[PDB]
Ligand binder design. Structure first.
Ligand SMILES: Cc1cc2nc3c(=O)[nH]c(=O)nc-3n(C[C@H](O)[C@H](O)[C@H](O)COP(=O)(O)OP(=O)(O)OC[C@H]3O[C@@H](n4cnc5c(N)ncnc54)[C@H](O)[C@@H]3O)c2cc1C
Ligand SMILES: CCCCCCCCCCCCCCCCCC(=O)OC[C@H](COP(=O)(O)OCCN)OC(=O)CCCCCCCCCCCCCCCCC
Ligand SMILES: NC(=O)C1=CN([C@@H]2O[C@H](COP(=O)(O)OP(=O)(O)OC[C@H]3O[C@@H](n4cnc5c(N)ncnc54)[C@H](O)[C@@H]3O)[C@@H](O)[C@H]2O)C=CC1
Ligand code: NA
Ligand code: NA
Lengths: 395, 202, 197, 448, 405, 251
């Protein structure tokens, strides 16, 4: 029964810490390990996940009540299992629906995607580990949760499975696994979906989980017209900066609320898991490019007048900066490299947001570009260090 | 001679073991018909260039060997381009600049210099035919996968009904972009070297 | 201005190595070391900058339809004219460097034989002809395409150097993993597709 | 003097600190010389089991380093010659008995500074004190014919549970000054005495220069001192010696006899009365720590916990460059969801554990790895503990990948295994970077 | 028509390109002769046009260097300290030249290509390497598949040799048949057991090969040698026989054969440590050379052991000589082991693999094996086994002398 | 031996140039015919005449399709070689083209050719419709199409996009047969004779005369199509020609 030894070892180590002792120098070791690091990152996104489920349910219910009423709404509820299951479990689908019903609908829409991505990615990881006679790394939990939190609520399960398969096998496993790749696996899977099935991950019919509802998101609305165009058609109210900051807007499950993401990011940064230098660089680049665009101005491209705070609260900027750009493996391994990496991420994200009409948001593409170019930053820093060493550090 | 001419297909692939003729493999592989026409053109050009170089291998001055070989290759490619414009105009338009880039294709020049220069005309012709056959095998595999999974079609014939035409299959847009060819070639090399471990690099 | 936009487009938006798969053989062969990749990129930059304008001048003077003489178009000599011009330029540059500038030949002249008939130069010239460019426009386009190719090769070299710590399965080690890395790089570079600069 | 402050490092707050008071200590009947602690040392034996040896008598020579003699710290009968796998000399053990000893020339305290370099080298080699010197790069015993223009005297000890060098040196100030004078005569360049702020006996020679180093543990390492004062490379080689060996050199050149007495801090979480004790070089630790450790399964370590040798079996003897005995508990226990519980009584460089909230806490650290072996994920722990001007993440990745050329370019030649001990401690992947560095240095030396 | 204009333009473009290339070559490429300096000696200098290899240039000049593999960067014995010039070091060269040696300036002569002025320093010992035309003396079979051949220099500048060295011999195109081989009845029975005479060789290309010597220094103007016929492997007899081996076996008394000068560094250290010799088959030649040099020319008192591994009794030679030497001096002890003795052998002594028997008999009870100098020479597999055994016994590479090549 | 090298190179160049020039000159006519027939097939397809095979395509195009040149500024027919005309080259040339201001350039096309080419579908001594080539910038590339307009000048018989580079599935649906067929019967201009064709998001009202369902999830391409039609139905486009045709310009 040695074939399933990897799975048995993974389960045993998950339940109990191993009793291994040191064998060489440094007979004492730090208490922190990959398990704790990955679990801390995984828990840091729990507030974002819960608010995302709540917001998805609330937006879906509002759109449903804005589009249908009475027997037509009942027919829609009966036609959708996401709706009649919520009704069955005590969650009303009416306008006077509580936070509990909204969270239940969000769960019905999110948990299937999370389960599918987790199962498929874990199967691929286990297959690779068993075939190559390795142990199971702990980063898959973070990869799966982050992938599940950056997709529209209405994503097909087969599409989610294909995306996670690509992100896990093509970007990580073929490179040896966790800690041995250069690209972000979750963002690689999301980009695979982006460029393979755009119709399901873009437009106006995917960011709100309501049947027959068409509504643009904040970035698209700002692109069309400008700041005055930000209106929530479901409720007919202007989208305020406070609304976007708290996360009461359509979009991906885990991206909407900047406040919850800020809380989780603050916790992980205080614990030292996430590099604050990368976050600072991202903020510096975003602010600089946004201010430059505002100063230059434009009479045709409304995005040119988007303030830095609006850039911060709109789209998946906060989620990317806090959890996707801080991936230690895909970032620079030097402090100066981290600064340059963050600055490049921010600049590229703002540039794709503004001067690229095809894509309303560009945080994922910017992070992929920065992942490609980070080794060059660390190489430049290392070459400077080597020159200093050859100079005997000025001695 | 069958083994000698079939060796380039798998034993010594121009794209899977040698790094040659990758531009056309990555670009033209969008459609199976274009891949097939490119395969035929490369086979013909390589075979004819090898044959002529072997015919006048002894009389070629060394100081202008590269120019003499490139002149023959360019003349053959120009003739092929004119032929593809006269017939198969749509395929020629789809191929675009890569028909002309066949001249700079590494396979043709490498075979001409390594084999045709110091080999008899008929063996050089056979070597060119085999190298083109292997290049075409790689191109055909990649293009078949790309076209099938990106359009539900083979040689323009529907094989998978698309949803847009009242079908059941949603085409994979990424199969019509650059990364698809890269990934397909990488995994094809993986499979080839898994079935032939002797080619595994260190 | 127009030239700045053209340079930016030819560097980022129009990237030869990944967008058009031009020069991929040397791209995947010489990307092992960052210094070697930088030298090869500089060589490609200089060769493209010295070839595209000469090819533009030759095309305008002779190969253009009806330019040389009324009712006569020699567009069927495009390929041989361009490839021969490039072959002559690369060889003469490699020889003059080896003669007068030994350090320059050692730094860059080593790679010129690989650029003599490289696909990147021919593809750039072919795209320039298929488009409409002046002499200055051709110079800027050649320089920008060379810079973009250098950027792509240097990024690939950096990634490959970083991958010294990776554990690639046998059979995928080397050419296959390089191909997968190039595909991921193309994915990352697709960010500029929608820009119409 | 000239003060250099280190901001990046880690002072391990391990429980059981020494009392910093010198005690008589137990009686040692077995004294051993460990053959595996000398880098690149292939021994040609000069004694056999049952042979009678005097103090400062050669037991074996070095094939790879001709002229280097390893002498007996004590006079008595050779009882064991322990050879491990591939007949690697694990240790040569001598039962102590008698007073017979070898003697050498002696000089007045006012002549040592003017002694000839050749005479000093001859006396040191004959007495065996030459092996006290270690060459950076490669941390090997210097060649007899070789010379260096920088001798680093480590008069400070920042290792956890380490004795205070000031207390030891105050007893032997005259010997320390004599050793400093001898080192000043021997060195072609300068003698950098690296110390803490507290005063120490001072030599009058212009060559000897006192340098004060402040900060956490890495401040006390000869590697850090070399990096900050005399950067080393293939073309520039420095020598390293500790204050106890300097006292021994001074005693040798003052009295004509080898000085083998040492003061070692016996301290640890499982030590009833941690304190400094007098002992002899190569003393048997099973007898040194006898009737002084709490019951249970424990590990005795010669050297600090960060960098030391597990004193078990043939290696159960005090090392040549170790001035400390650390006794720790064996952490073989398994607990349910231990990696998830709040970090009360858990120490970490990161703030992921509750322990860091309670300042001044002391942890009864064990030998547990606190996790399985995983790939290296650079969360930034190495930079927090590496003070040297280097890229620790990239250097450690090169060491893991076995890229000797890149490691040398990144500064692997200025490092010893003790320099990467904190990196090993803080690594979440549980890499032992000392072994990787030693392998890289061995490959570099063999190739060059 | 446009055909004429197109043809004219094509011809003009091609002619312009060719003329530009020719003019660039004429005005940039230097055609001057390249000068190679040896030890900075004007008398010992070479002039040659660019091209070829440095080894070929040196051979044409007259100075010879070890070419055991005959080029291709395999043996690596060709080593020249190029102080300046010669270009960088190739990856194939790096396979045998370490980083320290490369920094010192060592390069492979057969791999380095001469194109410009280069200065290299070569030890004066190389000037002692000369090419001679020796005469055959005896070609009597000495075993079933091992023969002793004695080539004598015609008193022409016979440079003294060193024990343990080897020479290099070139055989031009020729044709030989196994029938011409000389085999007394004792070995001819085994030879005809499988009708090994059915084989024949036809060399269509001169071949250069390096063979060890078998004569101690006290022997003047004599080059003894041992040759093992490279018979086709029993598993695949269809493969052709050994070119050089068959040619040497087909030689006749009085025939003139070309030989090169002394080569190799397989010399004994000038110490007093115990010596252990591990020979087998053709290794008997160098082992005998070393033993006779140490016991006759020097008459050293060091303890010496010689373990020889023969496939069968019929493969044992020089037994009487070694027994007489051991009787004369007890400091030398010999012990031969038969790995695969035939039933007719009736051997009663040591059997099995030489390394295993040596380890079980002597090294197991030896107090300080690391202090013993182990010289060995035999098949590659035997060398690997002995090296592995010695390493397991903690013997360093310095004390182990082997012809790695 | 420089003479031998010169002889061999010049002889090889002579033979290669002879064969290359022979092939090129021989195949020039066939290549021109192939390109012409490729254009003719699409023109006939938009006209609504079924044609299979090169011979049938040529015969039907010669019988029915009548090319003509129209000056945009005046809207009157202009004499010239309509069949062998390249409006793209004419637009590229500054002398034969006009630069457009930002307000004028609704379709984001830099230059407008002074003289365009239209095709009259002759039913026999009578025109049944006029096919106009329009084009405008899309999200990724420039999209070209043929619009067939009845003799009244206010009805769309058919539309086809014969050159586009939009993303398949999202932006490529302009080539969808259903989307193209939906265009039949629409009114280019309203009662006031102004651009009235509209692309409406989320479908169009049933029975609408000027509303066309947009491209799902492709609002940018739909906007490009809207801008193309708005420009090419205005004064700077075929507005004057269509106005003339409405009053019996063709008949
Ligand atoms: C420094 C030095 C010293 C040496 N000293 C001696 C010495 O003292 N005595 C001595 O005998 N040798 C000595 N050698 C070895 C010698 O140089 C030759 O390598 C050896 O004698 C074989 O010569 P050959 O002509 O048979 O070689 P080759 O022609 O290279 O090999 C012939 C052998 O290869 C087999 N073979 C070839 N191809 C195949 C195939 N496809 N399948 C199966 N079998 C195949 C043939 O059947 C035959 O057995 C020495 C070598 C060196 C470098
Ligand atoms: C596809 C197959 C099925 C799987 C998909 C998911 C659906 C099934 C499982 C859902 C889990 C919850 C089970 C049902 C709870 C029902 C609770 C209840 O009493 O009813 C709803 C109630 C709110 O009621 P109220 O708003 O007052 O309205 C009542 C009438 N109007 O509710 C409340 O008071 C609030 C209860 C909210 C519960 C849903 C949110 C759960 C989110 C946590 C999931 C996290 C798991 C992943 C993370 C990692 C886990 C290790
Ligand atoms: N470099 C030099 O100067 C010389 C090199 N040689 C090498 O030695 C070879 C000897 O060949 P033959 O005479 O045919 O040898 P052989 O067939 O007579 O065998 C000689 C010995 O090798 C031993 N042996 C073989 N395989 C072994 C294994 N796997 N493990 C342990 N012992 C093993 C046998 O037991 C025997 O004792 C030459 O062909 C050449 O390669 C020989 C003489 C000089
Ligand atoms: Na938000
Ligand atoms: Na955008």
């Amino acid at each position: 029964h040695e074939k399933w030894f990897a799975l048995y070892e993974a389960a045993a180590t998950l339940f109990y810490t191993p009793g291994l002792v040191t064998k060489r120098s440094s007979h004492v070791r730090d208490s922190v390990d990959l398990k704790r690091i990955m679990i801390m990152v995984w828990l840091a996104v729990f507030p974002a996940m819960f608010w995302g489920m709540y917001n998805a349910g609330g937006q879906a219910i509002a759109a449903l009540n804005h589009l249908y009423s009475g027997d037509q709404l009942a027919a829609i509820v009966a036609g959708n299992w996401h709706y009649w299951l919520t009704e069955m479990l005590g969650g009303t689908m009416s306008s006077d629906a509580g936070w509990g019903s909204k969270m239940l609908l969000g769960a019905t829409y999110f948990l299937p995607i999370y389960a599918t991505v987790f199962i498929v990615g874990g199967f691929w990881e286990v297959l690779f580990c068993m075939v190559r006679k390795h142990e199971v790394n702990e980063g898959f939990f973070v990869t799966s949760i982050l992938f599940a939190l950056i997709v529209p609520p209405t994503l097909p399960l087969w599409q989610a499975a294909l995306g996670i398969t690509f992100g896990v096998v093509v970007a990580k496993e073929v490179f040896g696994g966790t800690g041995r790749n250069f690209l972000n696996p979750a963002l690689a899977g999301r980009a695979f979906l982006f460029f393979a099935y755009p119709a399901q991950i873009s437009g106006d019919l995917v960011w709100t989980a309501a049947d027959g509802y068409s509504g643009a998101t904040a970035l698209s609305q700002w692109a069309q017209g400008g700041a005055g165009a930000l209106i929530n058609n479901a409720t007919g109210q202007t989208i305020t900066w406070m609304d976007a900051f708290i996360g009461n807007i359509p979009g991906s499950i885990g991206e909407v609320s900047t406040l919850a993401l800020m809380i989780g990011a603050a916790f992980i940064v205080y614990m030292g898991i996430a590099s604050w230098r990368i976050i600072g660089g991202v903020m510096i680049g975003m602010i600089l490019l946004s201010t430059l665009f505002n100063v230059i101005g434009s009479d045709t491209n409304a995005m040119f007048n988007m303030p830095w705070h609006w850039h911060l609260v709109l789209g998946g900027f906060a989620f990317g900066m806090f959890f996707m750009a801080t991936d230690p493996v895909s970032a620079s391994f030097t402090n100066s490299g981290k600064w340059a990496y963050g600055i490049l991420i921010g600049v590229m994200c703002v540039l794709i947001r503004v001067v690229n009409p095809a894509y309303p948001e560009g945080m994922m593409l910017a992070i992929l570009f920065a992942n490609l170019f980070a080794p060059l930053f660390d190489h430049v820093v290392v070459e400077r260090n080597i020159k200093r060493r050859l100079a005997r550090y000025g001695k | 001679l069958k083994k000698s001419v079939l060796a380039p297909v798998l034993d010594n692939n121009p794209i899977a073991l040698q790094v040659l003729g990758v531009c056309s493999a990555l670009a033209v592989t969008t459609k199976l018909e274009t891949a097939f026409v490119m395969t035929l053109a490369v086979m013909f050009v390589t075979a004819l260039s090898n044959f002529f170089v072997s015919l006048i291998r002894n009389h070629i001055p060394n100081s202008v060997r590269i120019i003499v070989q490139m002149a023959i290759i360019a003349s053959l490619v120009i003739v092929v381009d004119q032929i593809l414009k006269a017939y198969l105009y749509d395929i020629s338009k789809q191929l675009s600049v890569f028909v002309g880039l066949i001249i700079t294709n590494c396979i043709v020049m490498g075979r001409a210099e390594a084999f045709a220069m110091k080999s008899e005309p008929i063996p050089s012709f056979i070597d060119g035919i085999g190298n083109g056959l292997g290049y075409g095998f790689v191109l055909m595999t990649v293009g078949f996968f790309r076209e099938l999974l990106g359009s539900g079609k083979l040689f323009g014939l529907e094989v998978l009904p698309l949803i847009s035409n009242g079908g059941w299959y949603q085409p994979n847009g990424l199969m019509l972009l650059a990364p698809s060819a890269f990934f397909l070639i990488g995994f094809m090399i993986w499979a080839i070297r898994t079935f032939k471990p002797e080619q595994v690099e260190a | 201005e127009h030239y700045i936009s053209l340079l930016v487009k030819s560097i980022f938006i129009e990237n030869m190595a990944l967008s058009f798969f031009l020069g991929m053989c040397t791209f995947l062969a010489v990307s092992k070391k960052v210094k070697t990749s930088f030298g090869l990129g500089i060589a490609v930059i200089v060769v493209l900058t010295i070839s595209v304008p000469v090819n533009n001048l030759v095309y305008n003077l002779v190969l253009k339809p009806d330019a040389l003489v009324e009712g006569v178009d020699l567009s069927f000599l495009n390929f041989i004219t361009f490839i021969g011009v490039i072959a002559a330029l690369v060889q003469i540059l490699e020889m003059i460097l080896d003669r007068f500038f030994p350090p320059l030949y050692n730094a860059l002249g080593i790679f010129l034989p690989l650029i003599t008939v490289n696909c990147a130069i021919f593809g750039g010239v072919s795209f320039m002809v298929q488009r409409d460019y002046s002499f200055a426009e051709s110079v800027v386009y050649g320089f920008g395409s060379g810079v973009g190719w250098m950027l792509a090769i240097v990024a690939l070299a950096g990634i490959r150097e970083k991958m010294k710590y990776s554990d690639v399965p046998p059979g995928l080690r080397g050419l296959g993993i390089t191909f997968i890395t190039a595909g991921l790089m193309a994915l990352g570079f697709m960010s500029f597709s929608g820009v119409q600069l | 003097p000239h003060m250099i402050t280190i901001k990046k490092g880690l002072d391990l707050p391990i429980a059981g600190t020494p009392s910093q008071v010198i005690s008589d200590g137990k009686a040692i009947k077995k004294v051993a010389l460990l053959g595996e602690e000398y880098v690149g040392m292939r021994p040609t034996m000069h004694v056999r089991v049952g042979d009678e040896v005097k103090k400062a008598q050669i037991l074996f020579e070095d094939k790879k380093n001709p002229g280097v003699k390893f002498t007996s710290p004590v006079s008595g009968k050779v009882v064991e010659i322990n050879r491990g796998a591939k007949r690697v000399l694990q240790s040569v053990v001598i039962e102590v008995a008698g007073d017979d000893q070898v003697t050498f020339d002696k000089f007045e305290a006012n002549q040592l500074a003017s002694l000839n370099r050749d005479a000093i080298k001859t006396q040191l080699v004959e007495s065996g004190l030459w092996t006290a010197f270690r060459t950076r790069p490669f941390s090997k015993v210097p060649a007899i014919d070789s010379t260096s223009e920088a001798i680093f005297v480590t008069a400070m000890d920042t290792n956890p549970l380490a004795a205070e060098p000031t207390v030891v040196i105050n007893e032997q100030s005259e010997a320390f000054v004599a050793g400093l004078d001898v080192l000043s005569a021997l060195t072609t360049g300068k003698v950098y005495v690296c110390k803490k702020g507290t005063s120490l006996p001072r030599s009058q020679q212009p060559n000897v220069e006192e340098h004060v180093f402040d900060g956490p543990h890495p401040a006390g390492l000869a590697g850090t001192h070399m990096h900050f004062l005399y950067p080393v490379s293939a073309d520039h080689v420095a020598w390293s010696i500790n204050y106890q060996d300097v006292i021994a050199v001074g005693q040798l050149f003052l009295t004509g006899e080898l000085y083998t007495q040492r003061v070692v801090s016996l301290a640890g979480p499982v030590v009833n009365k941690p304190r400094l004790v007098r002992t002899v070089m190569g003393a048997s630790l099973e007898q040194l720590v006898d009737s002084e450790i709490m019951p249970g399964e424990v590990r005795i370590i010669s050297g600090s916990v960060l960098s030391g040798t597990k004193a078990t079996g043939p290696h159960a003897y005090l090392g040549r460059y170790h001035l400390q005995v650390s006794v720790l508990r064996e952490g073989r226990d398994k607990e349910l969801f231990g990696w998830a519980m709040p970090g009360k009584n858990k120490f970490s460089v990161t703030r992921s554990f509750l322990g860091h909230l309670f300042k001044g806490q002391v942890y009864n650290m064990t030998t547990t790895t606190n996790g399985s072996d995983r790939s290296m994920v650079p969360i930034g722990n190495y930079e927090k503990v590496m003070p040297l001007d280097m890229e620790p993440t990239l250097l450690l990745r090169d060491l893991c990948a076995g890229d000797s050329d890149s490691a040398v370019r990144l500064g692997a030649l200025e490092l010893d295994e003790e320099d990467l001990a904190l990196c090993t401690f803080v690594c979440p992947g549980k890499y032992e970077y000392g072994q990787l560095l030693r392998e890289c240095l061995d490959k570099i030396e063999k190739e060059g | 028509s446009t055909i004429i204009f197109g043809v004219v333009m094509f011809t003009l473009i091609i002619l312009a390109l060719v003329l530009v290339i020719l003019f660039a070559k004429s005005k940039l490429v230097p055609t001057g002769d390249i000068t190679i300096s040896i030890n900075g000696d004007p008398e010992k200098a070479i002039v040659t046009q660019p091209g070829g290899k440095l080894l070929t240039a040196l051979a044409g000049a007259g100075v010879f260097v070890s070419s055991a593999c005959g080029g291709g960067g395999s043996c690596g014995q060709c080593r020249v300290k190029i102080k300046s010039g010669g270009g960088d070091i190739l990856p194939t060269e790096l396979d045998h030249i370490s980083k320290g040696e490369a920094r010192e300036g060592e390069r492979l002569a057969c791999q380095v290509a001469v194109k410009a002025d280069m200065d290299l320093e070569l030890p004066e010992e190389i000037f002692g390497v000369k090419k001679w035309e020796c005469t055959v003396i005896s070609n009597d079979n000495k075993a079933t598949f091992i023969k002793e051949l004695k080539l004598a220099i015609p008193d022409g500048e016979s440079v003294p040799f060193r024990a343990g060295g080897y020479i290099q011999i070139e055989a031009p195109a020729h044709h030989v048949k196994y029938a011409d081989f000389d085999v007394p009845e004792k070995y001819r029975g085994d030879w005809d057991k499988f009708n090994l005479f059915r084989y024949e060789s036809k060399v269509d290309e001169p071949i250069i090969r390096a063979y060890s010597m078998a004569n101690y220094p006290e022997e003047f103007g004599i080059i003894m040698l041992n040759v093992r016929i490279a018979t086709p492997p029993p598993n695949n007899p269809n493969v052709p026989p050994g070119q050089m081996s068959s040619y040497i076996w087909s030689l006749k008394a009085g025939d003139k054969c070309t030989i090169s000068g002394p080569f190799g560094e397989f010399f004994a250290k000038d110490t007093d440590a115990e010596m252990v010799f591990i020979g087998g088959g053709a290794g008997m030649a160098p082992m005998r050379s070393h033993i006779f040099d140490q016991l006759k020319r020097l008459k050293s008192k060091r303890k010496m052991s010689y373990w020889y591994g023969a496939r069968s009794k019929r493969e044992m030679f020089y037994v009487e000589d070694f027994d007489g030497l051991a009787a004369e001096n007890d400091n030398f002890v010999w012990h031969c082991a038969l790995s695969d003795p035939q039933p007719e052998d009736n051997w009663t002594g040591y059997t099995g693999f030489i390394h295993n028997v040596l380890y079980e008999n002597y090294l197991k009870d030896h107090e300080a094996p690391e202090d013993c100098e182990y010289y060995m020479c035999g098949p590659p597999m035997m060398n690997a086994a002995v090296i592995n055994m010695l390493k397991n016994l903690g013997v360093e590479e310095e004390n182990i002398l082997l012809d790695d090549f | 031996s420089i003479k031998k090298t010169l002889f061999v190179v010049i002889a090889l160049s002579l033979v290669c140039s002879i064969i290359v020039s022979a092939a090129a000159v021989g195949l020039r006519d066939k290549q021109k015919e192939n390109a012409a027939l490729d254009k003719q097939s699409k023109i006939l397809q938009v006209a609504g005449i079924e044609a299979k095979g090169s011979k049938q395509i040529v015969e039907l195009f010669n019988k029915s399709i009548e090319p003509r040149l129209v000056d945009f500024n005046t809207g009157d027919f202009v004499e010239g070689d309509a069949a062998n005309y390249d409006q793209r080259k004419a637009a590229k040339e500054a002398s034969e083209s006009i630069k457009l201001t930002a307000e004028q350039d609704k379709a984001k096309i830099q230059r407008r050719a002074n003289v365009g080419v239209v095709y009259l579908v002759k039913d026999g001594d009578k025109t049944s419709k006029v096919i106009l080539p329009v084009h405008g910038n899309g999200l990724w590339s420039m999209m070209y199409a043929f619009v067939a307009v009845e003799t009244d000048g206010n009805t769309v018989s058919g539309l086809t996009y014969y050159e586009q580079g939009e993303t398949p599935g999202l932006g490529g649906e302009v080539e969808n047969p259903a989307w193209r067929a939906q265009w039949v019967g629409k009114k280019l201009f309203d009662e006031n004779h102004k651009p009235a064709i509209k692309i409406v998001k989320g479908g169009a009202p049933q029975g609408s005369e000027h509303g066309v369902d947009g491209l799902s999830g492709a609002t940018l391409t739909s906007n490009g199509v809207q801008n193309t039609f708005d420009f090419w139905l205005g004064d700077m486009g075929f507005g004057p020609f269509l106005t003339k045709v409405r009053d019996g310009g063709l008949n």
